[model samples]
Target chain A: LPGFATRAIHHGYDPQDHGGALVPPVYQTATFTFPSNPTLNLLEARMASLEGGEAGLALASGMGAITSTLWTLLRPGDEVLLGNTLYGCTFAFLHHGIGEFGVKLRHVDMADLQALEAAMTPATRVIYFESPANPNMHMADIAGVAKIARKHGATVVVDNTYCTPYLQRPLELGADLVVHSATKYLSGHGDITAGIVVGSQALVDRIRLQGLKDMTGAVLSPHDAALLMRGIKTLNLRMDRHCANAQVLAEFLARQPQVELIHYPGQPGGMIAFELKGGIGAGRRFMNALQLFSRAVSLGDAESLAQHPASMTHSSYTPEERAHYGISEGLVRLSVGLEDIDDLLADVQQALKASA
Target chain B: LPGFATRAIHHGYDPQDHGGALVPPVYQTATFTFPSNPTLNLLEARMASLEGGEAGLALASGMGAITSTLWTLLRPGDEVLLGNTLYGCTFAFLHHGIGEFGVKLRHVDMADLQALEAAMTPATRVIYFESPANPNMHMADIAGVAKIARKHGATVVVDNTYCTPYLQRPLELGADLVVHSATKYLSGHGDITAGIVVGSQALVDRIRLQGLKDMTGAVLSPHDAALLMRGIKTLNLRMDRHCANAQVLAEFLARQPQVELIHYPQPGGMIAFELKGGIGAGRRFMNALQLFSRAVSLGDAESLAQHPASMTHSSYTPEERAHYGISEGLVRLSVGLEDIDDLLADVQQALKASA
Candidate 1:
């Protein structure tokens, strides 16, 4: 029994508890409890609380959360409206993928409530967007959009991936559901990937059964779920550090002569974007020249990252779309990290010097 | 989201030249180059190698692999022909979930070619089934079904969950695709739930783009992928023990006085039988087992026995239960890789107590 208990804890998915206390039963254990479920349930319970929603679902990736949630609510012949700018893969799926499956799609600046409402009809069932959108910083009034969405009887799905609940809470602002690429800010470390959906019990339960259970089945692994929980404990501390660091970095770039334009969130969020005077060639050199910031795509990590949207994250958009979205070829996006402000400032100055 | 409309996406991450690094890093990337991250790719490549298919796409679960493939291929007007007997959840998805979207579904006895033929029409675009199907061991002729489907220009998709590539290579037998709930015999351990779809490069690629990338977004976690890779290292050995152990148990059950019926393919580990005493005896026999667990899920090292009418298949209707041939007294045993003597002894002890 000594060795048995030890092995059960380490090697067990359904690790037994004190004698008969761990019993399970009727109307439950759908798909046989899935074994190592406590970890996933804990993460979900925590995310639900954090996002101020009644229920939560943990999926494999952020895009999995986005796609699964949409697929649950949308049917063929139903229409979906989108924010004009989005993460590249999210854009790719909504534009190229969901349309192929028979759901109609339209995109307008969600901030333009008139345009967003004008794009809607009886067919429109969903409005999806990322607040302080990917690459370029685009803001939307969630409560404002909720009114327009209510007028049309459409669900408002917000990708809070860019701004974790620490920076923003969409639900309190009247959005129906909030989603996160828990891989980003929620799991601030760059180690693990996970997605989360927190919303009303009915809608999320539908996503779990129809979208996740029957549909894509993009389930979150227990191991990743634990890592996400670990990342979340420091979420407040890391987000605050990121905000402070990004603000200093943004102020320094605001005065740089080589910088043609800057896009920083009004409240100093972790993402920052600036365009170079010399355009694409200089932008590439600036990204290549970064020493402190890794030339990577993902954001909200402890280490800074700088990437070119035209060549990387927003490449799903063509040259024409990129211009329409105001994503210039000369633009460089930075995921301002928790690194010291002085070192980040030095790194950017030297990078600018090399590019010029 | 505009030219993103007409403009097709080409995933744009190149392997970084980070100080002349050689091996691809294991970052458990959130946004992978879609259809795969490097860690997930390793398992997909290994499955494609083992399954005799050109490519493999790993998803979050078996139901995921099934739904994604169906979503990628079947459109609104297309009709899907399902085997009369299927994993209950698969039936649920088609009957209730996908049915709402206008894809016509017909369940016919796949074992009966004439019945299968009676159900097909010009609208029929897909035929799906499991070989030596779940719980009941209803056998389907893979090559025969594929030939019939070919005449109708329909793709033959087989769920090889009960019979992994080790037992039967469905693709080599003419099926268009093979899907697995790798949580079972493939993973061998009950630690993670994962799904795999192995088929031609063209179809697998499209599934990744539409089904995995766009539709379900059901990507397998890299953590689970790594664990699955570890479990797979011992698959050949584990499967060998399972077959031998199950064959020995089948022979033992053959002599047991209370055992009324047994279904064993003689080559696989799964065994289903009815107690001569029916429901009460079935429950008592299952409750008496100390070594075997009374769990609904199966295909692991730990022995499991379950009442089909109350668990997985409980979702089905009473009218359809007899049609699918799952009786009220049907007791399914997923014989595990335990010592043959110990397994037989447990079954014998449980049988004595129930009787």
Candidate 2:
């Protein structure tokens, strides 16, 4: 557990004392014990210290972190200035949950600074965004966004999932809060589902104390927490491989004759989205042609993955929504992994040939 | 994976599918399908079929089921009622969470028939209880409460946790819905935290559409659900052994000197009560006890003994909590697979020594 990979599997859990088992048993019970008041207080303190938070509340999922954090920040009628580009679920959460709960949502296109400035109302509570926007790989200046949002009395909530803490520290970049799905690269392998929120002690304290957390009961279970903390230790190493492999895949695809566009940071990034020879037909051809890159809604795994944006990630968006987000039918996104570069390129080559 | 024990170890996930491993993997991604439609249908019908419901929603914990359900059901001004005995978290949810949302709570001394009937108002929205409640283990007359609640237009919600579907069907008994903190006996082994809701196709549908589920997202990861289903397979066997061992321990403790009173439904089930010399004496007695499992909670692989007045389920007003018939000295014991004679002897010795 002292080493990164070992800690990734063992740091947050102690299995020896628990029934003499090797794996940390899921202490699946909803409530835990304090034995005494001081013990509970100590437990709380230890949890905060361990999670690297002012105080931490583990939620049911990564979105639970996003949901409760938003719920705590937004009083009814408070405004959450949303970015035009966001994690699909984050967008949906703002569209459905927050709007239904009476919070005001103002969408600002990532490229249009004027739109963001215009949307900042007096009631603006938070400014939310994701860097190198999913699918499109659009980038935002965290420092610039944070300064603008703070000047207008808003917390800049950055979803640092794609570019995790090792890649980019949004907090240091001036964002007030950072959230992770923990399912992706953080866990290294795609196994358990978990989420974490990192921010000031005051904010987490409010989220925990207010009936929101206790009532919602979305706190991450201890078993999952141990598993998640196990995943975090490999955060740095996994991302290094992912970013390197992704660059190779992106560059190889870009050189293809049938390729029209390649959307990747093209440096140290795990994802790549490109357009093929035809439109939606090429997208269909690309998917049907792949034998190596698995077609799924998930990414950030150790294996390479390829997906058609229009049919998979952007399926929820109406034609109008797709156009607004610049989602073309021919767009294909790939989550490059630590898979052999030659095999990953060969799979794309074969798939591209079939599409041609 | 077919066997309960094997599935518990491997179902709901395959590590190899993830990265050539032996165990299920953990997926902790928050907002998956980045900048996409942001929703996944996931084809949960097969799962829904298992629960005998139209659909299922997973929460972070058992309280999530109640929270999401109540949030969807009661208006701010509505009144809700429940049986006197409940898991402390359930009591806290209705008493605090819903209360903060403006729902009026009228806790009925469920044992009092007239009190239950008289307490109902046109404003009453939910009638909640567990057949066999936590700690005290006082089982309500489900048939009677169901009928009474139906007459008043209140939805009857039962914590089907203690008795489970095998032992009791709350919906069949005129209750409208059932919720479980699957972390308990459902998982059998203390391995995961999750909650589930079961009811009619119509109610579950509406909740999915309007409830915190669609917007708030109290979902079980596919993995936790698989784990729970695995646990449920052995529900019959585990409960059988649990009830059997519990009977031996409860009946034996009832006759012990240091024990003041034990409230175990029947001779087994979970039991609790103050010590003969009161709370302090119970603490001293527990400290000396060696064999019976001592933990903060109940319903696990190993036998567990706990003091509820202070540990685990203490999130209640001391006075209000006392009405459920628990005391400062109440020691809640969950009988496990340990040898009955050894367990009894351990308790017997501890009791005699404490006295």
Candidate 3:
């Protein structure tokens, strides 16, 4: 139970719920025949334990977790000071979704402590940010931002999507709450678009009862909960490969002529962003040249994938907004998979030469 | 495509969605692999067609459907004119839940169209009621109520759980929207807990986007969607058995010496009655029943019964029940797919034991 991998495999496996079975059963029923669901309960507890949080709630989508958590803590006039760069969908929500509901939103570079502190108002009930912020990879000092929020009497919510609990425990570093689009490294495989919220039992229970029960009702399927449990069992294994493979690929990209620059965690994260020399045209050529990696947008799958975020995930942004956010047309994002090292290296090599 | 039974099975089973398969595949992934889900999409379309509504939205639970639909149509200043008796959770949301958010809820019997119209204010944007309301079996005048609400410039939402689309089409009766705890007869096997909201594409799409997508993220799991679709294929078959078996049981109880009263002018599987021995006698009968499971949920393959005051409708305050004329000795039966002879035998033995 103490070891990370051990807990991932067995922490929440209550054999009694399964008639002394080794694996948790997938209960596909909706009305919760029993007071509690064994499959969803296991996954929720495992996620909480892994993150070192007291409680957890599973939801329909990764966005579901973020939306539900914010809705719980905020009233009409409350303000949420968001980090500068984020996953595009997250960007849409803070800028467009909940903000439209009488909630005020202010954006600041969370990495810049003074600017972040300057942006926080007495009305700021929540401060939300993603570490190594998606696509752009802007890292936040979780402990520092959280320390500031504590003094200011505000909650610090961390979107720990890139580095899951295995590598970084945001709660231990002082985040009041943690959110995940478990669809990524947690599920590890390209399946199950789920989200989770973990934090103090008081806050978590509130989200479960009032926010989730009355409001969103965004519940998880027991079948998918079982699948997430299975995926997390190998989280320790997959993250290692993802981190290593990504590191090797980043190194390979560094030596390439067409790659103008590269941005990776300083194992580093599974994500690698590099700017191609000829901008969007060269990026297109490089992507078209790839024989191994697929062109899909999401990350943390066993099969490697790459995408041009400007035209894909972040297309919700206007050209002016993209410029303001520092998202460039040439910037390419990679979710390095668990493929063999040399095979990935070869694909990158050919793709780079073909781009030039 | 054909009739009720045939359409229930084949209406949405587009061979193209499943890549030339007869049955639709269960899409277990969350961030849908494709833009739309094959299984849930099939179920939604089928339900929309079954109810003859322009669109349908599938939700996590029956309450999920109700809450989302109401949340979609009402704001803080709006009012919801609810039927006097509803399923406990639905009642809970109206009085104790949504009311907390500043939306005023006024309870009026939909059966009393004159009173329901009087209950409506300019702020009233929605009229909601359960037909043959839950355990009480109180029926609403759908078209009459719908006409009143429409004239008042309000939307009328009918909970068609008791009648299902097989027995009644509320939309055709001028009801603007229809809702179902498909967990009941629609998912007749008592397997999946799901809900559906059906209405004009305009209102249904609004609920899907703003009400469901934004608030209450009550999404139906694709796996359970497939199960619901499987359960629905037999919807016509089960409702027929449910209605017939319930009628037979009601008639048998009427002849029994210990039974005090009954409500049998029904078009659905649900039945209700009181005993001469009152609360203790009803409890004894419930406990002594051999065949019907002493449980909460209705509309299953197996017969089920509940003590409304203590079980399913415990949320209805004792004072509230008295005001609504829900007797303390009420025992509601959800007749099942079993044969009448066996069901009758079980009731006779239980009644004698209670007497």
Candidate 4:
């Protein structure tokens, strides 16, 4: 009610439940002494309120959230149109997991509204995309896509992991649902792996009962849910710093001669994808030379991380597929953290020079 | 190597990793900053060793473990033969979840080898059963079923949640794999919810890579895995007391005139039962129990009681359920690690008052 930061901290929890404990103690128990638990409820409610959706359900992993969301909606023979670029695991799940159910998935450039429309057949039940799309930083027009999808009688599901609700709210742009791999920005710390889906209460409840409870059984441990809630309280502060540092680093990298192509969207955000002049070997050397940034897969943490798309995250796709999505052999995706801008820029400057 | 209890505590970890802390600390992490995680690996190793299997995988929950295991093995048009009695959720998953993928499931009494043989066809790729099955306390012939399944060229998958590895090891009897809820006896405390599948390295690896990493993505948290490993340390100790208490209570319940029947296998711990009067009266009897908790779940640290048909388990018509041994008046008593005399007295008073 007051603001994003204040609401995130105080939205769902009632201190009276745990005998006035300032912070909610982690409910580590598996099965509640009763059937339901308050800590789990608070986490779901907090997430739903933050995204301005009617309800939310937390799950064991981000992939778990994705599986439940799609499985609940898609029946056998239904088709899904995806943006050409996606988180690697998500792309793999579409090809391998959902494919097992006889569902069809077609990847398209969502930024090209004409291509997206042409790809949708009468069988298309859903249109899925990630804005400020992973690694490439290609942004989809949410309102434009939603309008076309609505005309086709299709649902719109957005992966809001990159631009969290603090930066962008997808449902406000007429998307039917918004999902988060809360492991990232929402749980700004790299401590917990969890996921959440937010939408109308009716749709969320169907997923909660059918997809999570019965089919997959990938429920989040209340302890991790509690940890996620703690991380979210500082999301507003962390994202602000992440955006500022990323912007400064992007500008500095653009001026460097060794950098071939900078994939910054001119936005205040942590992710900056760029290619080194010397290709894959240079990219590896640059990553290894970094003193502060961690070489890892996941993004949106308090500590900066660097990853090579071709070999690390998007290795599931073929060379031809990777090229189609603009993920090159030398491409590096950087997740800027809440560190001093000078320290970050200095690390990048030295790493770039050393690689060359 | 020394003993079950000793291996559980020391096999997977060395305290030196966490500044010599006597107990393993929870690693509350998503992806490891480096890559592989110690706590997750420890839990899997501990479980694999306990089951005497080549490998093990920890998952988010019991259903997660089951889904991953069968999904890995079964393909379209494959048939799975299940024992008549199963955990309610297991039954639901086979029918609704796996069934959606074009797999077939048939239920038969595993105790009767002939009925099991008759149920099998060329399409029967798997023979799945749970020993000392939930609510009913029906024990399956694990060795016998495994032998029959082997002759038919089918894999035998056993749900070992009820017996655990301490009481029984299915893999040793020629079963292909063993699964656990870990929430119950293995954890010994009801604080953590997790699951595990243990088998040959090749088979478990298939499940881990294909079902877990690709399809379902139900990996257990490092925090929960650590809690499970800690719970395993005291499993042997807790189970010994649980069995002792249950034996004494089951014997007492069988002699009561207010109870018409008893479903005790005379095992060490966990469950027992008798129909107090019948149907609605049995429900009231459970509600009246003072020391025993009237709850849904079973195999916990504290005593729990429930009417099976109404709450914890189910299905088919009343006549069909009766034919299969799931009775409407069947009251399940999950004997906990409590004082034996107090547990006996509590049941005695409740039976006398309600009946």
Candidate 5:
């Protein structure tokens, strides 16, 4: 009802309304003393309101949200056309779990409208993609893809992890459903592993009633949900600092002698991917030399994280596959944090110098 | 390693080792600062040791553990034979999720050895059942099922939630895997939702490596896992009190006019019974109960009651329930550590009111 920050802080919870506690207490019990669960109910409400969805469902992990949404929507023999540059773990789930269950997956570059259209089949039921796609930072026109999906009678689900709702809301972009690896930006502190699907009440109800409760059993714990609420309260403030610091660092890296093919699509977020002039050998050296940025798998934490996708997150993919996905051997994904612009820039300059 | 209570208290944690912290700290972070996660690792180790398992993997929920384990082991078109009496949620999962994926499900009364043998086909890959199954407390011969399953080249998986390792160890009886809704007895509190699978390293490793990592993404949160660890510390003490209270209540209910029949299969902790006046009376009795909380879950610190046909195990078809003797009037009683006299008095008064 109010602004983003105000709503995030006080949308679903009022401490004075519940025992006069400042923060909402974590409801750790699996089954509530009463029939209703106050903590989970409030979490769902806050998340649903944040994304402007009719309703929302919280899940155990980002994969849990993706898989549960897909399973609920698609039956056997259904075709799913996903973005080619999706996260590595998501690719594995498509090929291994959903594929084995008789669901056919066709990988296409969603940015290429022609490829997305050509890949559509009579069996195609969904067009799923991650905008500002992970690591490589490829952008998909959400409205453009939504139009194609609608024309083909397929639902469009967007993973908005890269650019959170504070920056972009996919539902407003005409996407049918919005999904999040809330472990990233939404929880900003990297202290929780949770996922959420925000969509029309009719759609989310089906997922909650059937897929979430019956099949996956990947419901978010109340404590983690509470932590998510805490993290989101400062999301807007953190994103502003993150975007500013990352832009400075990205510009610095672009002019460096050791950097090649910088891939930061102009956006309202803080993820950057760049290829090193020298291959994996120099890339490792640069990473080890960085004093501030952590070398880790996750992104959007308070502290900047540097990940080598080809060797770590996307290691499951073979060299040929990684190349096809534009994941270069020396691709360095930087999750810019709320650090000072000059300090972050200096760290990148030193790391680049060490690579040479 | 020393004894049930002693090992549960100190098996996978040391307070002196970790900054003199009394309890295992909840590592709520998603990706650990380092590669090795101390909290999750300790939880897995303690679970594995409890079941005499080579290894164990903790999951987000009981359903997560079951579904992950089954998907890892069975392929399309494989057959799974499960006990007729199981938690309703499990029944729905096998039918809706696994069944749709082309894995065939054959429901059989596991207590009937001949029926179990008959249900197995050449394509049968797994035999699964809950020992002293939920709601009715119908006992399955773990050793008997294992022997027959081995002969048919089928792996045996036992859901040991009803009778925790203190009362039964399915692996020692020659079963392949043991699963738990640690939310129930293991946690001994209704606060956390977690599940675990314990078995051979080869089996658990594959589940950990593939199904959990790739598909399900149902890893237990460090906060929930830590809560589970704390709950398990008093599992032996709480379970002994639960067993003692349940036996007293079961004996009292056996003689009540409102109870037609009682089903306590000579096991420790939590059970079910049928009302002489049927479903209407069962509901009335539950409504009238005071000391025993009228709720759905089983095995908590406080006593709870649930009507089986209407609530927890109602997923089964009425016809299928009749075959397994899960009557319409059946009420599940999860005995807690409350004073035995109070529990007996509550049942006595509730039975009088319903009758």
Candidate 6:
């Protein structure tokens, strides 16, 4: 059961502790009642056992975790420097919502070390970036950003979603905080959505004390928490299979005549971003041609999805913004899945021809 | 299906509305993408189809609904007048938490409408009261308070938890806001927990803008929301059986030799106040009692047992405080699907032993 797949089935829970029930019972409670105060006090201690941290709070979804973190951490007029390539909702939270509260978001090209360094001001309290950023698959220099942010005494928060803790543990790479959209790789299935942020004991306690308990009561229902916990147990195994399948398909997509150029962060991990030789129309045609892959929003499911970023997740982006972000109209992002690699490759090939 | 019990099973949803799915699907994601802006606008227009309101916002729990509403409706230096008796958590939220935000709680005895009338100051922005005030089952004069609150321009928010919309419709009684802890009768299974606030188009829109879309966000997951919607379909039926069963057990409890008192609202649901000699020994009796019941909490499918002066709603005070609130030696019983005769026989046998 310690194997990657088996562990997903058993991580962070002991049946004996839960009265020896088989198939974890969904503790569908809004608040937990402890046997005693001593039992309640141990929540902080037991939290660290699951993930390497002082303690952690489970939240409803990825946005819930990130928003709660920002709400607790920043006060009025505080500045947060972030990468331009961001997940849509997170960008909304930082730009309009937090800005209204006097928190300013300074967006800079994360790959350019000089831009990141120049963006930091006295008001800048936190440095945030996502490595191998979504849609574009742009990788940020974590060590470089962490060093520059350290000089300014700004806390560095790396969204290590694409490269999970299994591939890259950002906290160990001088990052002050590591946040994850646990809905992705951690919970490989597309069924449940959740999020977590792991960092120092003091920092974790500070947030839990401030925004988490009171203002943003985005408590992940006990049912979803247990489901997410169930999903994480098999993450290591799922990632290995997912990474390997992605590598196989990336090579095939590159060789196809209908494919213009491939954008994939080399083997063992990273999603595929490619353009159709016939341009925008063909790209959508290819998406339609694919029999196995679903044309839906979201990634990291057990089955593959072929999505158009310009039309789907980033439809709100202006033409200039989309161009600058390297998202062409014909660009299709393939979220590789656990399906057999050969079958996946064949489906992609067929879809490419159809789009062409 | 139009009856209270049947309405709980079929209201608030049609499979055609959800891609012809049998069971309601859980919408776990935060933001739902609309094909166009008009679709979203359309959803907002019909948001309050449940109890003939303009709109309703679903929350994680009943308390979340209450706290969020306060944050939305009251500003700093605003005052909220509440009934003397409330769900322990609601009292804590208003008294302890809202105070920090500069809102003060003014308690009024619902038993005396004159007390509520006198307590209202110009500072009072909202009048919040729970019907059959939580565990003690103190029924407030809804019509009386609504008239008083309306004259003062104060928005009346009624927590219709003890009596669900099936048994009581607060909105029909001139209340501006009607809140329900769907965790109880609305969710007949007692598995899912939720809170719902129903009101007019403008008032609910303001709350959604403030409480839901912005300031706070403890949303009911699509799955839980679906379960709740499913639960409401048969709400009328469940309340019918629940009240019927509860009345039978309450009457049986009154006849017991060891049982000293029973505090049920004029219109009843399951909660029996038994004076087992004294308040200090109530918890011991709950633990020692056989076949009567055994559980830490209430408002569930299974029958639950608790001594409120000691456990559950023990936040009030000692026996002295309990005596004042009529909570002394109180065992709040949540009668379940078991035969009423079986429950009565069980309570009678347990009372004799505890005596």
Model 1 / residue B79 / CA error / Å:
1.3
TM-score of each: 0.49, 0.48, 0.52, 0.52, 0.52, 0.50
Query: Taking the candidates in order, what DockQ does each have?
Result: 0.01, 0.01, 0.01, 0.01, 0.01, 0.01
Residues B176-202 of candidate 4 have per-residue lDDT tens digits of 899999888888778888999999999
lDDT tens readout by residue for model 4, A221-301: 877887899898889889999998988888888889998878774563688888888877888789889999988988899
* Higher-scoring candidate on lDDT, 1 or 5: 5
Model 5's number of clashes is 2
Ranking by lDDT: 3, 5, 4, 1, 6, 2
In model 5, how large is the Cα lDDT of residue B54?
A: 84
- Worst window of 10 by summed lDDT in candidate 3 chain A: A29-38
Point out where model 3 deviates above 4 Å.
Answer: A32-35, A135-138, A314-321, B1-355
Evaluate fnat for each of the predicted models and list the values in order: 0.00, 0.00, 0.00, 0.00, 0.00, 0.00
> Model 2 over residues A30-96: C-alpha lDDT tens digits?
3323221111222233333333445445566678778878877887889888776677677788887
After the best TM-score superposition of candidate 5, give how far the Cα of residue B316 lies from its true spot, in angstroms.
Answer: 71
Assess each prediction's global lDDT (C-alpha) against the native. 0.79, 0.68, 0.83, 0.82, 0.82, 0.69
Q: Residue by residue across A249-345, what tens digits does model 1's lDDT show?
A: 8888888999987866545368888888987778878888889999898888989999987776667888788788667888888889988899999
lDDT by residue (B1-355, candidate 6, tens digit) is: 2544433444454545433434433434334333111122222222245455666767777876787787889989788888877776877887788767888888778668888888888888899888877545766678888888876688999888777766677777778888777777667677788777788877777776787668668666556665666566655566677678888777777777677777663443567676767666576667666655676544555666777677655676665565446456777777776667777777665665565
Candidate 6 local lDDT, A111-214, one digit each (tens): 98998888888888888878877645766788888888877688888777777667777776787777778788767788888777778878877766776776
Model 6 residue B272 lDDT score: 64
At residue A289, what lDDT does model 4 achieve? 93
DockQ score for model 3: 0.01
Model 6 chain A worst lDDT window (10 residues):
A35-44
Cα lDDT, model 6, residue A96: 75
lDDT winner between candidates 5 and 6: 5
